[PDB]
Amino acid sequence: IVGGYTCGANTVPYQVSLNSGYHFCGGSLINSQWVVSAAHCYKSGIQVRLGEDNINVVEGNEQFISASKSIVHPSYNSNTLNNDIMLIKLKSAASLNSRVASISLPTSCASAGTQCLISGWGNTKSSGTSYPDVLKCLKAPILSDSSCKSAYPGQITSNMFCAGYLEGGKDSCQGDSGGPVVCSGKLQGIVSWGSGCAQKNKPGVYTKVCNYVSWIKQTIASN
Ligand SMILES: [Ca+2]
């Protein structure tokens, strides 16, 4: 997260870190046994870390649970990042408490101009490189589809939306991939892609979760 703020320990209780010997992507806990992330975050050998603030210090509220199965969306296209969404099933259920909690799926899609909360342990510089140890947060608005399409002509599908600031300075970044965009208490986006981070006229591009709720519910009901 570039241009954000320190969240506060366990104030984003649905945020997970995906770990394959190191933190590599975020995700969101949607019930006691399932996490949503980005398909471009796929790797073998995932451990899900819940209740994290400082990813480099064991502080006492963490739960570390290995993935039993990963399921990348059937229509994921790694070239275009269309359908950039994956489910991860935990080997055992998480214990839900004030520090570890699930986020609701949307029933309706979110509106342009809504201010959303984006969070992660990704790079904090626009260029140059500096990764935080504690969770960072950013408030950012949903942009109109026409502004999104103007910023990335020929690249935006109906399964993407843009959020952030056309002047630059505030954005998600590498390492935040797979993490949540929460608007009005619902998971509306997944950190997916962008040209750089926090560059002028190059806002963040997010997977549109509300187009996937049927697939998520059917997959969880069968696995
Ligand atoms: Ca920790």
**In the chain, where the domains are located:** 1-12+103-210, 13-102+211-223
Residue 54 known to bind ligand = yes
In the reported structure, the alpha carbon of residue 15 is separated from the centroid of ligand 1 by a whole-number distance in angstroms of: 13
CATH architecture of the domain with range 1-12+103-210: Beta Barrel (2.40)
SS3 77: strand
Residue 57 known to bind ligand = yes
- Do β-strands 47-50 and 115-120 pair in parallel, antiparallel, or remain unpaired? unpaired
- Do β-strands 34-37 and 186-193 pair in parallel, antiparallel, or remain unpaired? unpaired
In the reported structure, the alpha carbon of residue 62 is separated from the centroid of ligand 1 by a whole-number distance in angstroms of: 6
Please name which of 70, 78, 72 lies closest in space to residue 18, comparing C-alpha atoms.
70
**CB count in 10 Å sphere of residue 96:** 15
For the domain made up of 13-102+211-223, give the CATH fold: Thrombin, subunit H (2.40.10)
Query: Within a 13 Å sphere around the CA of 175, how many CA atoms are in the beta-carbon half?
Result: 21
Q: Please identify which of the residues 40, 73, 102, 192 carries the catalytic annotation.
A: 40
Report the amino acid identity of residue 100: V
Planar angle of CA 12, 18, 22, nearest 5 degrees: 120
The answer to whether the 1-12+103-210 and 13-102+211-223 domains have the same CATH topology is: yes
Respond yes or no: is residue 177 known to be catalytic.
yes
CA distance 79 to 193: 12
Burial of 199 (0-12, 13-18, 19+ CB in 10 A): middle
Name the phi and psi angles at 87, rounded to 5.
Answer: -105, 145
Q: What is the resolution of this structure in A?
A: 1.5
Respond yes or no: is residue 53 known to be catalytic.
no
- Do β-strands 23-31 and 34-37 pair in parallel, antiparallel, or remain unpaired? antiparallel
Structure-determination technique: X-ray
Report the amino acid identity of residue 223: N
Please name which of 61, 59, 53, 169 lies closest in space to residue 121, comparing C-alpha atoms.
53
